[PDB]
Amino acid sequence: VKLLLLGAGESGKSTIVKQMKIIHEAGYSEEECKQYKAVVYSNTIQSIIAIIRAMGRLKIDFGDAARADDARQLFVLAGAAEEGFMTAELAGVIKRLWKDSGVQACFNRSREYQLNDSAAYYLNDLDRIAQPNYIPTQQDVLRTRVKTTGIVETHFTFKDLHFKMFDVGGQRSERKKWIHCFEGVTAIIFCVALSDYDLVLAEDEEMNRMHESMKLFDSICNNKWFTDTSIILFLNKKDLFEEKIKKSPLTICYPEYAGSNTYEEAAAYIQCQFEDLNKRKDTKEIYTHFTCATDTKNVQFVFDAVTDVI
Ligand SMILES: Nc1nc2c(ncn2[C@@H]2O[C@H](COP(=O)(O)OP(=O)(O)OP(O)(O)=S)[C@@H](O)[C@H]2O)c(=O)[nH]1
Numbered sequence: 001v002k003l004l005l006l007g008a009g010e011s012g013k014s015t016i017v018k019q020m021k022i023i024h025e026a027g028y029s030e031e032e033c034k035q036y037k038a039v040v041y042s043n044t045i046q047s048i049i050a051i052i053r054a055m056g057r058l059k060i061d062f063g064d065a066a067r068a069d070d071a072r073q074l075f076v077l078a079g080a081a082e083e084g085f086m087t088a089e090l091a092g093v094i095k096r097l098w099k100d101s102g103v104q105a106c107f108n109r110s111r112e113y114q115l116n117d118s119a120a121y122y123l124n125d126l127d128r129i130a131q132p133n134y135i136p137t138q139q140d141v142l143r144t145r146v147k148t149t150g151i152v153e154t155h156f157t158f159k160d161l162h163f164k165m166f167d168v169g170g171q172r173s174e175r176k177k178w179i180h181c182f183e184g185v186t187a188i189i190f191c192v193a194l195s196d197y198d199l200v201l202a203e204d205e206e207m208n209r210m211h212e213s214m215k216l217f218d219s220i221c222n223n224k225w226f227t228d229t230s231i232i233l234f235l236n237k238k239d240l241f242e243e244k245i246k247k248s249p250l251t252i253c254y255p256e257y258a259g260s261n262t263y264e265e266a267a268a269y270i271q272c273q274f275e276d277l278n279k280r281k282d283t284k285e286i287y288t289h290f291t292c293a294t295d296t297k298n299v300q301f302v303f304d305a306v307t308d309v310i
Protein backbone atom coordinates (compact mmCIF):
# COMPACT_ATOMS: atom_id res chain seq x y z
CA VAL A 1 0.00 0.00 0.00
CA LYS A 2 1.57 3.27 -1.13
CA LEU A 3 0.16 6.43 0.48
CA LEU A 4 1.05 9.99 -0.56
CA LEU A 5 0.32 12.95 1.76
CA LEU A 6 -0.40 16.20 -0.07
CA GLY A 7 -1.60 19.65 0.93
CA ALA A 8 -0.35 23.20 1.43
CA GLY A 9 2.22 24.27 3.99
CA GLU A 10 1.49 23.63 7.69
CA SER A 11 -1.61 21.62 6.91
CA GLY A 12 -0.62 18.76 9.23
CA LYS A 13 0.94 16.20 6.86
CA SER A 14 4.11 15.58 8.89
CA THR A 15 2.12 15.21 12.12
CA ILE A 16 0.15 12.30 10.63
CA VAL A 17 3.51 10.66 9.78
CA LYS A 18 4.57 10.92 13.42
CA GLN A 19 1.24 9.34 14.54
CA MET A 20 1.84 6.20 12.47
CA LYS A 21 4.99 5.61 14.57
CA ILE A 22 3.14 6.16 17.84
CA ILE A 23 0.18 4.04 16.79
CA HIS A 24 1.72 1.24 14.71
CA GLU A 25 5.11 1.02 16.42
CA ALA A 26 5.86 1.80 20.06
CA GLY A 27 6.16 5.57 19.85
CA TYR A 28 9.32 7.57 20.19
CA SER A 29 12.08 6.21 22.38
CA GLU A 30 13.95 8.25 25.00
CA GLU A 31 16.81 8.94 22.57
CA GLU A 32 14.42 10.02 19.79
CA CYS A 33 12.51 12.37 22.14
CA LYS A 34 15.74 13.94 23.32
CA GLN A 35 16.50 14.76 19.65
CA TYR A 36 13.32 16.87 19.59
CA LYS A 37 14.35 18.76 22.70
CA ALA A 38 16.13 21.39 20.62
CA VAL A 39 13.15 21.76 18.21
CA VAL A 40 10.82 22.38 21.18
CA TYR A 41 13.14 25.10 22.55
CA SER A 42 13.68 26.55 19.13
CA ASN A 43 9.91 26.55 18.44
CA THR A 44 9.29 28.25 21.81
CA ILE A 45 11.88 31.03 21.35
CA GLN A 46 10.72 31.70 17.80
CA SER A 47 7.08 32.03 18.94
CA ILE A 48 7.73 34.63 21.66
CA ILE A 49 10.06 36.48 19.27
CA ALA A 50 7.43 36.54 16.47
CA ILE A 51 4.97 38.15 18.94
CA ILE A 52 7.52 40.76 20.23
CA ARG A 53 8.40 41.63 16.61
CA ALA A 54 4.70 42.18 15.71
CA MET A 55 4.11 44.48 18.69
CA GLY A 56 6.54 46.88 17.07
CA ARG A 57 4.82 46.83 13.69
CA LEU A 58 1.24 47.13 15.10
CA LYS A 59 2.46 49.66 17.69
CA ILE A 60 1.41 47.71 20.76
CA ASP A 61 3.02 48.61 24.07
CA PHE A 62 3.81 46.28 26.93
CA GLY A 63 1.30 46.39 29.76
CA ASP A 64 4.24 46.87 32.14
CA ALA A 65 7.23 49.00 31.11
CA ALA A 66 9.70 46.74 32.94
CA ARG A 67 8.93 44.12 30.30
CA ALA A 68 11.13 46.25 28.05
CA ASP A 69 14.18 45.08 29.99
CA ASP A 70 13.04 41.46 29.79
CA ALA A 71 12.63 41.83 26.01
CA ARG A 72 16.24 43.02 25.88
CA GLN A 73 17.46 40.06 27.96
CA LEU A 74 15.52 37.64 25.78
CA PHE A 75 17.70 38.32 22.74
CA VAL A 76 20.94 38.28 24.73
CA LEU A 77 20.00 34.82 26.07
CA ALA A 78 18.11 33.32 23.06
CA GLY A 79 21.23 31.66 21.65
CA ALA A 80 21.35 28.89 24.27
CA ALA A 81 17.82 27.59 23.58
CA GLU A 82 18.76 27.14 19.95
CA GLU A 83 21.50 24.78 21.14
CA GLY A 84 19.03 22.70 23.17
CA PHE A 85 19.70 24.50 26.42
CA MET A 86 17.20 26.33 28.58
CA THR A 87 18.36 28.18 31.67
CA ALA A 88 16.02 28.98 34.54
CA GLU A 89 16.83 32.60 33.85
CA LEU A 90 15.68 32.38 30.21
CA ALA A 91 12.50 30.56 31.27
CA GLY A 92 11.77 33.38 33.72
CA VAL A 93 12.24 36.10 31.13
CA ILE A 94 9.81 34.36 28.72
CA LYS A 95 7.20 33.53 31.34
CA ARG A 96 7.04 37.17 32.43
CA LEU A 97 6.75 38.32 28.78
CA TRP A 98 3.98 35.77 28.01
CA LYS A 99 1.87 36.96 30.95
CA ASP A 100 2.12 40.61 29.96
CA SER A 101 -1.23 42.09 28.90
CA GLY A 102 0.30 43.88 25.91
CA VAL A 103 1.90 40.65 24.76
CA GLN A 104 -1.44 38.81 25.11
CA ALA A 105 -3.30 41.53 23.17
CA CYS A 106 -0.82 41.05 20.33
CA PHE A 107 -1.08 37.27 20.74
CA ASN A 108 -4.80 37.65 20.12
CA ARG A 109 -4.15 39.41 16.79
CA SER A 110 -1.98 36.60 15.38
CA ARG A 111 -3.81 36.45 12.03
CA GLU A 112 -2.19 39.82 11.22
CA TYR A 113 1.25 38.16 11.16
CA GLN A 114 2.73 34.63 11.03
CA LEU A 115 2.73 32.57 14.25
CA ASN A 116 3.14 28.82 14.90
CA ASP A 117 -0.01 26.97 15.92
CA SER A 118 1.84 25.41 18.86
CA ALA A 119 2.95 28.75 20.35
CA ALA A 120 0.45 28.69 23.24
CA TYR A 121 0.87 24.95 23.91
CA TYR A 122 4.59 25.38 24.71
CA LEU A 123 4.41 28.87 26.22
CA ASN A 124 1.73 27.78 28.69
CA ASP A 125 3.83 24.73 29.71
CA LEU A 126 7.09 26.60 30.31
CA ASP A 127 7.52 25.38 33.89
CA ARG A 128 7.49 21.78 32.68
CA ILE A 129 9.69 22.16 29.60
CA ALA A 130 12.24 24.42 31.35
CA GLN A 131 12.93 21.65 33.90
CA PRO A 132 16.42 20.26 34.39
CA ASN A 133 16.53 16.87 32.62
CA TYR A 134 13.40 17.64 30.58
CA ILE A 135 12.62 14.94 27.98
CA PRO A 136 9.94 15.74 25.38
CA THR A 137 6.71 13.75 25.75
CA GLN A 138 5.00 12.14 22.72
CA GLN A 139 2.62 15.11 22.50
CA ASP A 140 5.50 17.61 22.67
CA VAL A 141 7.04 15.72 19.72
CA LEU A 142 3.73 15.84 17.76
CA ARG A 143 3.53 19.61 18.47
CA THR A 144 6.93 20.49 16.94
CA ARG A 145 7.06 22.48 13.72
CA VAL A 146 9.84 21.79 11.17
CA LYS A 147 9.33 22.62 7.48
CA THR A 148 9.66 19.51 5.31
CA THR A 149 12.20 19.57 2.47
CA GLY A 150 13.01 16.57 0.31
CA ILE A 151 10.94 13.39 0.34
CA VAL A 152 10.41 11.41 3.56
CA GLU A 153 9.58 7.75 3.32
CA THR A 154 8.13 5.76 6.23
CA HIS A 155 7.10 2.07 6.39
CA PHE A 156 4.83 0.22 8.81
CA THR A 157 2.61 -2.86 8.92
CA PHE A 158 -1.05 -2.68 9.87
CA LYS A 159 -3.83 -5.23 9.41
CA ASP A 160 -1.36 -7.47 7.57
CA LEU A 161 -0.76 -4.69 5.04
CA HIS A 162 2.70 -3.21 4.57
CA PHE A 163 2.45 0.54 4.13
CA LYS A 164 4.93 2.90 2.44
CA MET A 165 3.97 6.46 3.32
CA PHE A 166 5.38 9.43 1.46
CA ASP A 167 5.60 12.95 2.83
CA VAL A 168 6.71 16.17 1.03
CA GLY A 169 6.69 19.92 1.83
CA GLY A 170 3.56 21.93 0.97
CA GLN A 171 5.00 25.41 0.65
CA ARG A 172 5.32 26.91 -2.83
CA SER A 173 9.04 26.21 -3.24
CA GLU A 174 8.60 22.49 -2.54
CA ARG A 175 5.61 21.75 -4.77
CA LYS A 176 7.85 21.33 -7.81
CA LYS A 177 9.11 18.14 -6.08
CA TRP A 178 5.68 16.51 -5.88
CA ILE A 179 5.97 15.01 -9.39
CA HIS A 180 8.79 12.75 -8.22
CA CYS A 181 6.30 10.78 -6.02
CA PHE A 182 3.48 10.35 -8.56
CA GLU A 183 4.18 6.67 -9.44
CA GLY A 184 2.09 3.73 -8.19
CA VAL A 185 0.15 5.70 -5.57
CA THR A 186 -2.59 3.59 -3.92
CA ALA A 187 -4.26 6.48 -2.12
CA ILE A 188 -3.73 10.18 -1.51
CA ILE A 189 -4.45 11.71 1.87
CA PHE A 190 -5.00 15.38 1.12
CA CYS A 191 -4.68 17.54 4.27
CA VAL A 192 -6.44 20.88 4.73
CA ALA A 193 -6.17 23.10 7.80
CA LEU A 194 -9.73 24.19 8.70
CA SER A 195 -8.32 27.06 10.80
CA ASP A 196 -6.55 28.59 7.75
CA TYR A 197 -9.73 30.41 6.64
CA ASP A 198 -8.72 33.84 8.05
CA LEU A 199 -4.95 33.55 7.54
CA VAL A 200 -2.72 34.53 4.58
CA LEU A 201 0.20 32.59 3.07
CA ALA A 202 3.57 32.92 4.68
CA GLU A 203 4.85 33.01 1.05
CA ASP A 204 2.46 35.81 0.10
CA GLU A 205 0.43 38.01 2.41
CA GLU A 206 -2.10 38.84 -0.31
CA MET A 207 -3.23 35.22 -0.75
CA ASN A 208 -5.77 33.62 1.62
CA ARG A 209 -4.53 30.25 2.88
CA MET A 210 -7.81 28.40 2.33
CA HIS A 211 -8.23 29.61 -1.26
CA GLU A 212 -4.72 28.33 -2.01
CA SER A 213 -5.76 24.94 -0.59
CA MET A 214 -8.80 24.83 -2.82
CA LYS A 215 -6.68 25.50 -5.95
CA LEU A 216 -4.34 22.65 -4.98
CA PHE A 217 -7.16 20.18 -4.31
CA ASP A 218 -8.89 20.99 -7.61
CA SER A 219 -5.51 20.45 -9.31
CA ILE A 220 -4.90 17.08 -7.65
CA CYS A 221 -8.44 15.73 -7.51
CA ASN A 222 -9.07 16.14 -11.25
CA ASN A 223 -5.61 14.98 -12.52
CA LYS A 224 -6.09 12.22 -15.13
CA TRP A 225 -3.07 10.45 -13.64
CA PHE A 226 -5.00 9.89 -10.40
CA THR A 227 -8.16 8.38 -11.92
CA ASP A 228 -7.79 5.08 -10.11
CA THR A 229 -6.23 6.45 -6.93
CA SER A 230 -8.50 6.83 -3.91
CA ILE A 231 -8.68 10.41 -2.65
CA ILE A 232 -9.03 10.80 1.12
CA LEU A 233 -9.69 14.34 2.35
CA PHE A 234 -8.61 15.17 5.92
CA LEU A 235 -10.17 18.46 7.08
CA ASN A 236 -7.59 18.99 9.80
CA LYS A 237 -7.09 21.23 12.87
CA LYS A 238 -10.74 20.82 13.87
CA ASP A 239 -9.74 21.75 17.45
CA LEU A 240 -8.42 25.14 16.41
CA PHE A 241 -11.33 25.71 14.01
CA GLU A 242 -13.79 25.02 16.81
CA GLU A 243 -12.38 27.86 18.90
CA LYS A 244 -11.81 30.26 15.99
CA ILE A 245 -15.28 30.08 14.43
CA LYS A 246 -16.79 31.74 17.52
CA LYS A 247 -14.76 34.92 17.14
CA SER A 248 -13.69 35.10 13.51
CA PRO A 249 -16.24 35.21 10.70
CA LEU A 250 -16.02 32.63 7.91
CA THR A 251 -17.27 35.34 5.53
CA ILE A 252 -13.64 36.56 5.52
CA CYS A 253 -13.00 33.52 3.30
CA TYR A 254 -16.42 32.75 1.81
CA PRO A 255 -18.38 36.07 1.60
CA GLU A 256 -21.47 34.17 0.49
CA TYR A 257 -21.59 32.07 3.69
CA ALA A 258 -25.06 32.60 5.15
CA GLY A 259 -24.98 30.09 8.02
CA SER A 260 -24.36 30.68 11.71
CA ASN A 261 -20.99 30.84 13.48
CA THR A 262 -21.25 27.29 14.80
CA TYR A 263 -18.82 24.42 14.27
CA GLU A 264 -21.22 21.91 12.65
CA GLU A 265 -22.65 24.34 10.13
CA ALA A 266 -19.31 26.02 9.23
CA ALA A 267 -17.49 22.66 8.97
CA ALA A 268 -20.14 21.15 6.68
CA TYR A 269 -20.01 24.23 4.37
CA ILE A 270 -16.21 23.94 3.96
CA GLN A 271 -16.54 20.23 3.24
CA CYS A 272 -18.99 20.96 0.42
CA GLN A 273 -16.75 23.73 -0.97
CA PHE A 274 -13.96 21.18 -1.41
CA GLU A 275 -16.12 18.28 -2.51
CA ASP A 276 -17.73 20.49 -5.13
CA LEU A 277 -14.36 20.82 -6.94
CA ASN A 278 -14.48 17.15 -7.92
CA LYS A 279 -15.53 17.19 -11.58
CA ARG A 280 -16.21 13.45 -11.87
CA LYS A 281 -18.79 13.42 -9.06
CA ASP A 282 -20.60 10.34 -10.48
CA THR A 283 -17.50 8.33 -11.27
CA LYS A 284 -15.09 9.50 -8.54
CA GLU A 285 -15.62 9.34 -4.79
CA ILE A 286 -13.92 11.46 -2.14
CA TYR A 287 -13.63 10.11 1.39
CA THR A 288 -13.77 12.99 3.88
CA HIS A 289 -12.73 12.89 7.54
CA PHE A 290 -12.44 15.72 10.10
CA THR A 291 -9.32 15.35 12.19
CA CYS A 292 -7.13 16.66 14.94
CA ALA A 293 -3.67 15.43 13.78
CA THR A 294 -2.12 15.91 17.22
CA ASP A 295 -4.81 13.73 18.86
CA THR A 296 -3.58 10.12 18.72
CA LYS A 297 -6.96 8.54 19.57
CA ASN A 298 -8.69 10.55 16.84
CA VAL A 299 -6.10 9.66 14.20
CA GLN A 300 -6.14 6.02 15.30
CA PHE A 301 -9.88 5.61 14.64
CA VAL A 302 -9.87 7.66 11.45
CA PHE A 303 -6.96 5.58 10.07
CA ASP A 304 -8.82 2.40 10.99
CA ALA A 305 -11.79 3.60 8.93
CA VAL A 306 -9.53 4.73 6.11
CA THR A 307 -7.68 1.41 5.83
CA ASP A 308 -11.00 -0.40 5.48
CA VAL A 309 -11.69 1.92 2.55
CA ILE A 310 -8.30 0.66 1.27
N1 LIG B 1 -3.52 22.07 17.41
C1 LIG B 1 -3.31 21.46 16.26
N2 LIG B 1 -2.10 21.60 15.72
C2 LIG B 1 -1.88 20.74 14.71
C3 LIG B 1 -2.77 19.90 14.12
N3 LIG B 1 -2.17 19.22 13.05
C4 LIG B 1 -1.01 19.78 12.98
N4 LIG B 1 -0.73 20.67 14.01
C5 LIG B 1 0.47 21.51 14.22
O1 LIG B 1 0.66 22.34 13.06
C6 LIG B 1 2.07 22.60 12.84
C7 LIG B 1 2.44 22.30 11.43
O2 LIG B 1 2.13 20.96 11.09
P1 LIG B 1 3.04 20.03 10.14
O3 LIG B 1 2.61 18.63 10.26
O4 LIG B 1 4.50 20.34 10.32
O5 LIG B 1 2.54 20.49 8.66
P2 LIG B 1 3.03 20.09 7.17
O6 LIG B 1 1.83 19.98 6.35
O7 LIG B 1 3.90 18.84 7.27
O8 LIG B 1 3.80 21.37 6.63
P3 LIG B 1 5.09 21.46 5.60
O9 LIG B 1 6.02 20.34 5.99
O10 LIG B 1 4.36 21.25 4.32
S1 LIG B 1 5.70 23.29 5.68
C8 LIG B 1 2.83 21.66 13.80
O11 LIG B 1 3.31 22.40 14.92
C9 LIG B 1 1.74 20.66 14.28
O12 LIG B 1 1.97 20.21 15.59
C10 LIG B 1 -4.13 19.84 14.63
O13 LIG B 1 -5.11 19.23 14.20
N5 LIG B 1 -4.27 20.63 15.76
Ligand SMILES: [Mg+2]
Pocket residue numbers: 013014015146147148167168169170
Ligand atom coordinates in the same frame (compact mmCIF):
# COMPACT_ATOMS: atom_id res chain seq x y z
MG1 LIG C 1 5.91 18.50 6.74
